[PDB]
Amino acid sequence: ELYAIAKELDSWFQDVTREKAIFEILNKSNYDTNRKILIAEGWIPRDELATLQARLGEMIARLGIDVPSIIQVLDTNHTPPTFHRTNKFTAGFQSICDC
Amino acid sequence: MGATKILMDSTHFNEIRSIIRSRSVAWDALARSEELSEIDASTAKALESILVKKNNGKTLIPLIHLLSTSDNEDCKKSVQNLIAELLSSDKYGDDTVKFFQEDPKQLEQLFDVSLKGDFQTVLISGFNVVSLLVQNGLHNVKLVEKLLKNNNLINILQNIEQMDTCYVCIRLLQELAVIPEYRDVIWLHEKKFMPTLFKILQRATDSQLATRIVATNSNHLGIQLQYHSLLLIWLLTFNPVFANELVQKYLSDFLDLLKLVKITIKEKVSRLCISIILQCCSTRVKQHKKVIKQLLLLGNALPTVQSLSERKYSDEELRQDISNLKEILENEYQELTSFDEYSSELKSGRLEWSPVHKSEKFWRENAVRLNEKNYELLKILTKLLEVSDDPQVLAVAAHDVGEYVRHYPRGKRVIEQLGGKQLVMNHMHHEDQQVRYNALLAVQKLMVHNWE
Amino acid sequence: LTPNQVNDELNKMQAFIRKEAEEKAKEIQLKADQEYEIEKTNIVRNETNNID
Amino acid sequence: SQKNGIATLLQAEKEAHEIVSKARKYRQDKLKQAKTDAAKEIDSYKIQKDKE
């Protein structure tokens, strides 16, 4: 039985770990009991915003019921972080730079 | 007019409306071209001319009879639905109720000029009239007799590849179902449609409509067809005796409905599943316990029970639903002072894996039952075990012997009276590895705790 | 797209939720009607026993 | 929007709560109506039986 089962006990481990992770993703989110649409916000770049504000549908193309998404435009006080790139070839250089 | 307003959120009704309604075509030249008495066409034309908001409404009454025995399907459908809405629009003839009322002869005559032609014709001719048999206060009990013993519309509903048809037919069926004294009469015709009601849900069962790998499973709002179906199935929730019998015929699909609670992401759908299955329960009618017994027998929902329990959905109605559900399904679960039923099984000569067969929550101390006759009550089962090799009974017979000896360590003498260890090892040398596993469990636990 | 689309989505979902609450409340009121009827039934049944 | 979107959400919320509360009030009214209707009908029926 061990021989047979371990083969995919490992797969269940991966799966439960992933499902866990998505919980925690939800668990630093909001919830209210009586109102039924949540209050939410995103911290993805304006640089790549177009592709994802499009893929709203692609995601909802996999679950489309009524809402491609809800995203209302407003920016409040905050300091956006900084992002940088290495192209997997200058890894040592920029890695040392940042560290 | 507080009468029926139907499917406003929908569009297939709107397409089958606008296909002939949006046509702002001549509705006067018809009779003049050898179709009818001419004033009838003049007023069919005046329909739209007077359609302008005029804040009359008493110069179109007689036209109902005129289109009765028509012989060219060109000049009723359109103005038919136009006047139907004009009524529906609660701005024209809001007191047309009385004229509708004093004698529905002008209405019940409509049968032969309604629900006729092709399926689309049947709809365009039937929806309008049925919207008007919603006359607040009582409603005609007699027209329905002819509207149901008929068969052409039902033939229209028999198709499976078309969803709009059955959707709208049974949707208006449930809207009119607001008169609780009609589910009764249609009951006798159950076998004609209720299986149709069930086929959609049976498809929904393993068909993961939510997973959009199903290309065009239904229109973007089409899935609401299931919502409406279960709406109807709830509309029959005030007569238990009705639910009492038809179950014996199709209990299986009703049972495996269980999945819908967890499967559908939609709150509405799981909600209606659970509510319907529960409300089947009632102190009102008889044998209102064996149903859950078979539920446990085949489905074993309690896992599912608590599973859905841990994940409530902030719906008070649902809170009470599930709370009832759990308590009502669990309190009987301990209905096992099983000396009586163990004796019945003993005399039955049949055994099977069952919580009635297996529940230690009582066996904490029950050797008293074993004490009836020198512990030989199970010796009969042992000799039958020796007699044959039927998997279920063969395994279960020695399955609980280990437990029973676990109940008395002193029972080593009765055990050696058994002395079936050779038979036990033989069972480790027969088919169905599971029963071999069980036999090994029995023998091993026994020996170990005789010399633990 | 445009904020109009998302605003309309908010409002249409709100309308749908309001319809859901209305229809469920209607189910519960109809259940009130059934409890009404059955309670009246048993009361009148006992009364009929005594009167008979 | 949101400056009025929040207000619209609040109005939808109070709409839902008010409609469900009205439904429950109608439920209790159905119970009291069961009492009253049982009383009225059974009084009439007692008159019926006595006259009979």
Swiss-Prot record, chain A:
Mod. after translation: Glycosylated.
Subcellular location as annotated: Vacuole membrane
Signal peptide feature range: none
Subunit (UniProt): V-ATPase is a heteromultimeric enzyme composed of a peripheral catalytic V1 complex (components A to H) attached to an integral membrane V0 proton pore complex (components: a, c, c', c'', d, e, f and VOA1).
Family of this protein: Belongs to the V-ATPase 116 kDa subunit family.
Functional summary from the UniProt entry: Subunit of the V0 complex of vacuolar(H+)-ATPase (V-ATPase), a multisubunit enzyme composed of a peripheral complex (V1) that hydrolyzes ATP and a membrane integral complex (V0) that translocates protons. V-ATPase is responsible for acidifying and maintaining the pH of intracellular compartments. Is present only in vacuolar V-ATPase complexes; enzymes containing this subunit have a 4-fold higher ratio of proton transport to ATP hydrolysis than complexes containing the Golgi/endosomal isoform and undergo reversible dissociation of V1 and V0 in response to glucose depletion.
Note: Present with 55714 molecules/cell in log phase SD medium.
Protein known as: V-type proton ATPase subunit a, vacuolar isoform
Residues shown, of full length: 298 to 396 of 840
Curated annotation (Swiss-Prot), chain B:
Keyword Transport in record: yes
One GO MF term attached to the UniProt entry: proton-transporting ATPase activity, rotational mechanism
Secretion signal, residue range per the UniProt entry: none
GO BP terms, alphabetized: endosomal lumen acidification; Golgi lumen acidification; proton transmembrane transport; vacuolar acidification
Gene Ontology, cellular component aspect: fungal-type vacuole membrane; Golgi membrane; proton-transporting V-type ATPase complex; vacuolar proton-transporting V-type ATPase complex; vacuolar proton-transporting V-type ATPase, V1 domain
Primary localization: membrane
Assigned keywords, A-Z: Hydrogen ion transport, Ion transport, Membrane, Transport, Vacuole
Record bears the keyword Transport: yes
Topological category with respect to the lipid bilayer: Peripheral membrane protein
Protein's cellular compartments: Vacuole membrane
Gene ablation phenotype (knockout): Increases the ATPase activity of membrane-detached V-ATPase V1. Abolishes growth at pH 7.5 and in the presence of calcium chloride, abrogates growth at pH 5.0.
Miscellaneous field: Present with 22500 molecules/cell in log phase SD medium.
Similarity-based family: Belongs to the V-ATPase H subunit family.
Subunit structure: V-ATPase is a heteromultimeric enzyme composed of a peripheral catalytic V1 complex (components A to H) attached to an integral membrane V0 proton pore complex (components: a, c, c', c'', d, e, f and VOA1). Interacts with YND1.
Primary role: Subunit of the V1 complex of vacuolar(H+)-ATPase (V-ATPase), a multisubunit enzyme composed of a peripheral complex (V1) that hydrolyzes ATP and a membrane integral complex (V0) that translocates protons. V-ATPase is responsible for acidifying and maintaining the pH of intracellular compartments. This subunit is essential for activity, but not assembly, of the enzyme complex. This subunit is also required for silencing the ATPase activity of V-ATPase when V1 is detached from V0.
Protein name: V-type proton ATPase subunit H
Organism of this sequence: Saccharomyces cerevisiae (strain ATCC 204508 / S288c) (Baker's yeast)
Gene name of this polypeptide: VMA13
Swiss-Prot record, chain C:
Subcellular location(s) of the protein: Vacuole membrane
Protein name listed in UniProt: V-type proton ATPase subunit E
Location of this fragment in the whole protein: 8 to 59 of 233
UniProt effect for mutating T2A: Increases ATPase activity 1.4-fold
Coiled coil: 8-38
Summary of subunit composition and partner proteins: Homodimer. V-ATPase is a heteromultimeric enzyme composed of a peripheral catalytic V1 complex (components A to H) attached to an integral membrane V0 proton pore complex (components: a, c, c', c'', d, e, f and VOA1). Interacts with VMA5; the interaction is direct. Interacts with VMA10; the interaction is direct. Interacts with RAV1 and RAV2 components of the RAVE complex, which are essential for the stability and assembly of V-ATPase.
Other comment: Present with 16134 molecules/cell in log phase SD medium.
Recorded superkingdom: Eukaryota
Species this chain originates from: Saccharomyces cerevisiae (strain ATCC 204508 / S288c)
Family, similarity comment: Belongs to the V-ATPase E subunit family.
Gene: VMA4
Lineage: Eukaryota, Fungi, Dikarya, Ascomycota, Saccharomycotina
Region listing for Interaction with VMA10, in residue ranges: 12-31
Function: Subunit of the V1 complex of vacuolar(H+)-ATPase (V-ATPase), a multisubunit enzyme composed of a peripheral complex (V1) that hydrolyzes ATP and a membrane integral complex (V0) that translocates protons. V-ATPase is responsible for acidifying and maintaining the pH of intracellular compartments.
Region Interaction with VMA5: start-end pairs: 1-13
